[PDB]
Each structure stands twice: as C-alpha cells, then as structure tokens.
Amino acid sequence: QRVSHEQFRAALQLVVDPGDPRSYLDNFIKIGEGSTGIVCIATVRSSGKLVAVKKMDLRKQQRRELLFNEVVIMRDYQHENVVEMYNSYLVGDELWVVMEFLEGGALTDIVTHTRMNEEQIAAVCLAVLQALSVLHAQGVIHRDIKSDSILLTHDGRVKLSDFGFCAQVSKEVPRRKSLVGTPYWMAPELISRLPYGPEVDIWSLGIMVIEMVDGEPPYFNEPPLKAMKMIRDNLPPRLKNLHKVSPSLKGFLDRLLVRDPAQRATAAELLKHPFLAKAGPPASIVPLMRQNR
Amino acid sequence: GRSRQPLVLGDNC
C-alpha cells in the first residue's frame, strides 16, 4: 500500500526529468480539469514563453501505471499535428508534464456552440489522420479521440493532444485489451475488452465526426454505462443531421464506423479518401473560434 | 448523461 506508492514513485523518477520545475515556472493560470488532473498555463522565466502544465496526482488515478505511458512514449516526439511535450517532472506526489500551449483552445468549444461546414470538417479530419497515420505506423494508440482532445492554434492549425491513455503495441505484443476511453466515443471491440489495435482510434474519430455534424455523440443523454451497452450491442449509430451531409462525407463516415475492425479503414487508407480533398486551409477554421464569433 | 469524463476500469486493483 505505502509500499506500492513508494515503488511506483521511484519507478516514475527513472523516466522523468530530475529537478523541480517550480523554480522556473511562474504565473500559473488554471484552464481545465483534464483527463487525470489539472491543466494550467505558465510562464517560463528564462525565455518568457508560455507553456501548458498538466499535473496529475499519483494517489488519484484509477490505474496508476497508465501514468508511465505518455511520459515515455511521447518523449521526443515531433509532428506538426501533435502537441509537443517538452519535459516531465515529479513534484511532491504529482507528475507534471510540461508542453506546448495551444492558444486556440479545444475543438469542443466550437462543436457545442457552432456548426462546422464540410470544408472545416475535412481540415480537422485530415490533420487528425496525418497525426494518426504516423502514430499508428509506430505502434502508438491514442485511445481517447474526441473533440476535447483536439487543440487549435490562433491561426486554425490543428493538433492532437491528451495522450494520457495512449498505449504502445509491438510485434510481440500487438494488441491491448484495457477498458480505457470516454464512454460515448469507445469502439465496441474495446468496450467488450477484446484484443484491439489502432483501429479503435478510427472508430472514435467517427464519433467525433458525428460530434462535428450533430453537436454531440450518439446516445449522449443516456447515462455512460447504458450508452456503452448500446454501442457494444447495436448497429453503427446514424447521424441525426444526415440530410445535411454530402455523399462524400457519408461515404467517409461509413469507412470509420465499421464494427468489424478488420473491415474498418486504416488511417493510411483514409488519407486517400476523396472527402479530404475538400479540406480548407487553417484560415477556414479561424472564424469558428470563440474570439472571432 | 452528457458526461465528457473518461472512464478507466480499475481491472487490476
């Protein structure tokens, strides 16, 4: 009990940066309760730069070992559509991850207050899929794809974030089985805790497409647990606003929201899909952001 | 209903 705490803390120490970041970070401004703790922005004293700091209490996780994943897996990851992690530290009983601050905030604010058009939807889906093709080719599953995990720059550039539940697969351990995600976005094979791969993020992306069209995921008013039962048991959920979606968006969505995971399109395939040729540039997103509306 | 919060099953606790 105390023994498992102390061991866990020593283990994490081997993968985090040594040192106390409190000596260099000032002006903490809370922006969220995120997945697994609080997210603040702060100023780096030596550079004047703003960063985002996620702080996760070691004693408050459902599965403490998941805290190993992001801090190891995302360590020196560079991709234009993925939130960059700068360092991590152990501060008392908290893990702090310091990362790039996305001043445009999250896609959730948009999707609940406005209606994206298909140009904008394709731009988001292209960005996310560029991120997921590269991630998935090196064994990394995100496992919490939803609008809250998509962040924006001031000029409409899109980046994937919230890697806290991400997982690494490999040749010798190619599948995971953990019930991890956000209930309404979870793939049905993951709900059933069957072995699963990168395919799970493709299904969640489908649900996020439903968010972008309808405003919310299917069965959102149902309590989480029954909603999960429905997803597991029913046929693919349908858009409420289907009459407003183009034939190419419908055909795109049909390749995402497939139950049989071996039939579901991969990110690399979806990158070639004609829906994505409608993608707008970063500027097309900017009108939707809270500050411009 | 309408919850945006993640769920992690503590299956090994």
CATH architecture of A102-293: Orthogonal Bundle (1.10)
Residues of A annotated in the binding site, as ranges?
31-39, 54, 100-102, 162-164
Q: Could you tell me the residue ranges of all domains in chain A?
A: 1-101, 102-293
Residue A124: φ, ψ to 5°: -65, -50
Total residues belonging to chain A: 293
Burial of residue A275 (number of CB atoms within 10 Å: 0-12, 13-18, 19+): buried
Give the Cα separation of A87 and A222 in Å (integer).
39
Q: For the stretch A31-50, what's the b/e string if a residue is b when 16 or more beta carbons lie within 10 angstroms of its beta carbon? A: eeebbbbbbbbbbbeeeeee
Place of tokens 């609080």: A38
Angstroms from A292 CA to nearest CA on chain B: 25
User: Entry resolution in angstroms?
Assistant: 2.1
Q: How was this structure determined?
A: X-ray
Residue A144 a catalytic site member: yes
Which residues lie below 8 Å from residue A239, measured CB to CB, with a gap of 6+? A210, A213, A214, A245, A253
* Amino acid occupying residue A27: N
Q: Which CATH number fits domain A1-101: 3.30.230.70, 3.20.20.70, 3.90.1150.10, 3.30.200.20?
A: 3.30.200.20
| A68, burial (CB in 10 Å: exposed 0-12, middle 13-18, buried 19+) | middle
User: Residue A181: its chain B contacts at CB < 8 A?
Assistant: 6-7
A203 residue type, one letter: W
